Amino acid sequence: QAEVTSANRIRKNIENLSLGELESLRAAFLEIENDGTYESIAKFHGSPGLCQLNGNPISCCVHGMPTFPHWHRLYVVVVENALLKKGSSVAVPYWDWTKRIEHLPHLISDATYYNSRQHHYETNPFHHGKITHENEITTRDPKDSLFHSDYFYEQVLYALEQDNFCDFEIQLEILHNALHSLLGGKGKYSMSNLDYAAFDPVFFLHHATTDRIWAIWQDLQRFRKRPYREANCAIQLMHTPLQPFDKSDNNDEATKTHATPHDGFEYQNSFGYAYDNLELNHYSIPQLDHMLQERKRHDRVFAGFLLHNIGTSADGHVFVCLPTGEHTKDCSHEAGMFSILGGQTEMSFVFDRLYKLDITKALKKNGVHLQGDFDLEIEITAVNGSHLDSHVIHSPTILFEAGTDSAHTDDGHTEP
Amino acid sequence: VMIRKDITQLDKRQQLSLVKALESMKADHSSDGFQAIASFHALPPLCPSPAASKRFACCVHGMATFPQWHRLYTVQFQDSLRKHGAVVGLPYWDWTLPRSELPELLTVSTIHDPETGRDIPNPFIGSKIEFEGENVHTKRDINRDRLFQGSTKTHHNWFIEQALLALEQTNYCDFEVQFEIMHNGVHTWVGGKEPYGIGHLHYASYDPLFYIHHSQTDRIWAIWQSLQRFRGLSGSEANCAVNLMKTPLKPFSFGAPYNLNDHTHDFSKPEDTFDYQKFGYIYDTLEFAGWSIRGIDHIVRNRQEHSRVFAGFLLEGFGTSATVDFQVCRTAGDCEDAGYFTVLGGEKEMPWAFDRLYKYDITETLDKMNLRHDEIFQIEVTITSYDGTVLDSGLIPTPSIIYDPAHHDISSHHLSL
Amino acid sequence: HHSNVDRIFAIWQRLQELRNKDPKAMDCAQELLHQKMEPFSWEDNDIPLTNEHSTPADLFDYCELHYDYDTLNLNGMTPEELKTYLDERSSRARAFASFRLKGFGGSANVFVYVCIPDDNDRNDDHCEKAGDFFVLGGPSEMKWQFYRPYLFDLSDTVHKMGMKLDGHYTVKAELFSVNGTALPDDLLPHPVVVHHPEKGFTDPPVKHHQSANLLVRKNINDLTREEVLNLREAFHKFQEDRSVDGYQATAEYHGLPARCPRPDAKDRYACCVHGMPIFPHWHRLFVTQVEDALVGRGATIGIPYWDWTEPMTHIPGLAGNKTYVDSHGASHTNPFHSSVIAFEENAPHTKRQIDQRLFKPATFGHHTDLFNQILYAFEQEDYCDFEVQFEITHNTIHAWTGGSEHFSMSSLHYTAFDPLFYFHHSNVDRLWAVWQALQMRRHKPYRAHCAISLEHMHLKPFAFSSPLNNNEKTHANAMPNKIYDYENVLHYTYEDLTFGGISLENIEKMIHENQQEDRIYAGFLLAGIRTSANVDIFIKTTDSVQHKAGTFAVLGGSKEMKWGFDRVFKFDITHVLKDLDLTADGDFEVTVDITEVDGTKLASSLIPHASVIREHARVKFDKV
């Protein structure tokens, strides 16, 4: 589907950027920070809550909704347009998180930018920003600089596998949150917080990649020959206008037209921004498709989580404990973990469907079969580190998924 | 091979046995006895323990395990009747067909079996709720006789439409949600307004109709298994809800003194439950409204061929049983009765919520409406209790509207036109 | 049934006779014994015999009842046989579990299981049943709770399990009602396992050897100006230290803010252990932490101890002096004098009100109230018995010093802030050490018989590695068991281990002397419920003449975790009663006045009626 590729602008990986390209970016962001748009643009994501200009405020970003990728997609273009106004030569770059990174990107990391052409010493606008309303500086605390793993890939890959958009979104959103918690860490004002996260400049880069992945899914969809720009799920939501994009606060005309999420699908020509390459982990789209199939080959067992994400962001860890010790491994304690981004401001949201995580590898390792009786233990911790009552949260279910070839029964007789 | 047949088919002798057996069962002082058996399903609640402060009702309702639990429940009664000298397996009342007259076996108050020549009340007609003080006959107010108001074509019935859809799903879980809801309708229809009846979770096990209904429902479940075999999926094997299947179901798991029955006890794991043969009982026929199993599979594919629109309901879990009616209203404000479904429940009920959506086919209504998927229309729902009191909206989530275009019409012209 | 039990009871009397103890005599429960037993005493009943018999004292003589038992034997064992058999039992050391019995509600059955805390995997389910006991009780029964714990012999099960006494396990108990209603286990306290202590030349596994004495703790009075000067400077520097090792942070450990459960816990509770046998261990560790700080401060000497026991004319002045003009340098405030509460942002009333003049005249030199109380504690052979008495005496200083001021020593939360806190605890720690030394004279080692389970648990926040504790040493001896040998692990010493100038040997002989003297005690069950309070008790006669029996105080705060003494606290009634010339048996009302630190009156309902126990005289024992 042609709709995905752009003619007008190119979005490239941050590493790819030439010194010249970065230089425009450094300047543009710095100027945007100076300009009115930067602070106000940040507001759209979270605090201050713009959604109800008057009346009780709520965070604007749609989260926990299928509308979610559309909203953020619009958000990135908003900043991109701002950058262009700034005089940015290129589109916002994307920090491919999935790719394991030896170190954090130089562009973001640099505290100061020499910018030799004009002798000046300034902080890197990419490095951080300040939160005007709540007087503070954004902070980052990657607890885990560790991230070098298939884990991102698995999560995203799993998301890629789903044909259904809505099924896709739930998985997609979850992987999305990982960057936020991982970068923000403990820091109250950071990526880790729903309200604060918009402030950090990394936000733009991260969303750019997430948006790119969404685009990737889109192109894959056409490979499947499913309609690229068609969602037959959450129809009601799609038509809804996406604030604040709808309002006059948003100068950007394109976004306003774009407010309905339905229109959002075709980034190409709508947005007029393209990606240098649409591949995941250097896998061609047809390559991904083949890769997906292989995964399908084995039977899989998953744990499903009903996310009624409420409250501040929190991390959850879970593993399936087995009733016996002896020969059999004790609680592995590492089924996998997922995080949820949230804040008090956020509007309540509940996932329509379960969030599936693939337990299979761990279960096999422990040597349990699907049939084997096992319990799932979950621990939910706030970013704060306060324990959250698990009792309220519904227990996760265990699903077994197989391909067309299913097993025949021992007891009973299927064929007549 | 104990055989379960249509209640109508049953012989006078067959009937004779059931009437006597149940009546004797009623008398049975034993824990195996009827009054005791009834308590399994609902009040008095046995679940946490027979003697526990807080007790919950034994309903693995709203769960995948649900058909298995009820399947064991029926056999528990069946085995009991056999102890009584029941000649055959519990018969099934096929609601699917429209029925002008309610089944005579259950309906008649008095039974004058010719052999004895004596007249006694039909134990099948009702029972008394001993523990509940109400020493009343388990009352059924089938206020809605309307059940017999089937369609004119007569094949297509609400039950049939609902059931057929359930049959369509390959996934056991998906199948069960549709399957279970269809199950609920009979409970409400018979129980009606009456406080002690089929309508209430607590009381329903007391009425004898319960067994007949579940027998039919179990029959349809068996039908699904046979279809799955045709599909090639193993009938016994369940892919879904593996965790629940392993767990044993009480009170069946609680053997004596509460559960004399050995078979159910061993069988308490639902995994074991699928092969009904393990409980040696069979059904005279496995078919749905005259369609062969092969015919059913072929027909279902055809159903897909046309576009369909559905509304999905997430069932959060109600309080007491209630029935819901929903209608689609146009922007203009016209509104048409979309359709209805009901949920059985009581206070005692353990909490439960469905993992997935419950689809209902809106298509016919919308088509008349000449409304498209795109069209902006609102769906309004009203929930009413058994009493008829209106229940508030607000807690209730809105339904989604899904569009099912014809997808994979798997075909070649091999069917006769 | 009762005939048999009565028979068994008689048997016990018979065995006592074998003991050559007066079977009839019942020293304990004097209060109840005199009480007549209704309805028999009510005399609604026809039989006058019972009416006279109503006093339980009369009850012992079965013969008065004039009913006999054909034989008094238990399970075919002669009474001689029983006595000999029991002797053998005492031969072996055993492990027991102590259970408090609330004994409330209808009859209930309880089960206890010792499970092995180990559980690597798969929703572990492995455990064994220790044993059980039953209780009888109707819905309308007088509330009763066992004063004493009920021991059970775990040793059999432990061995059976294969778990040696030395093994890490936990125990849990379940209660089932006759009705079958489950009863909340949470209310019930955790039972403690006790192992038979071995008391001989070296109880702990470490080798205490003749100490070098690098850090010494001296009393404040001995401290010279130079010594005080370094201390003043060190404290000043210390309070300045913003670091976690810093003073403010150290203060938090004791009380508010309550870090203890975790820095992030739903229920934050005061970390300090009070009302527990663990209590001296935690405090001892606490003092070291400050002390380790002082050395960093550069303090020449360890924390000094303010021997409260000695009578004091007035405040030491080191603490008291508001401003310290060393004059060597420039005048400043005395860091000893006060501290500030950063979180509350209030100021501690370091200049606490000393409502009570501690300065007390002695019967003879050393004899003092605190001495008496403290000495009493020392007398007890049992660590746990000692702790109760010891802790209470400890409490008095806080109440006296703090006085009415909310922010002060008087408050559990606040107390840490006051610098006196360190001084007092140093002394208290000294007494604890003295007790151990005395035990040593007794040839009672460090090995503790009581609170085995408690000792194993590590004491936070000292345990917290990741949360704020700079000091590794404290972390090392988180466990209270390690705590006992202060010298080896802590490597701190005291200039002298004497109490009142009494040599350790001298004190031991001294204790014997008190033993010879007749003494009736009033026992108070102290489940210290709320904010700190002071309690004064006086005995009222029929004459309604009342004399003040004496006083004791308890420290507490809302934050404090709930605690209750297993055993009663004893005070010596004897002198007053003698003066009254009232007999122990005589009917005298006991009135208790509980005054809150606030000074608001507190209802007597808080305290249950104290029992009176009379201790008859024994012969003078051993002397060096």
Ligand code: CUO
């Ligand atoms: O989600 Cu709103 O931030 Cu990535």
Ligand code: CUO
């Ligand atoms: O299901 Cu529980 O009753 Cu028909």
Ligand code: CUO
């Ligand atoms: O005991 Cu904790 O305080 Cu002196």
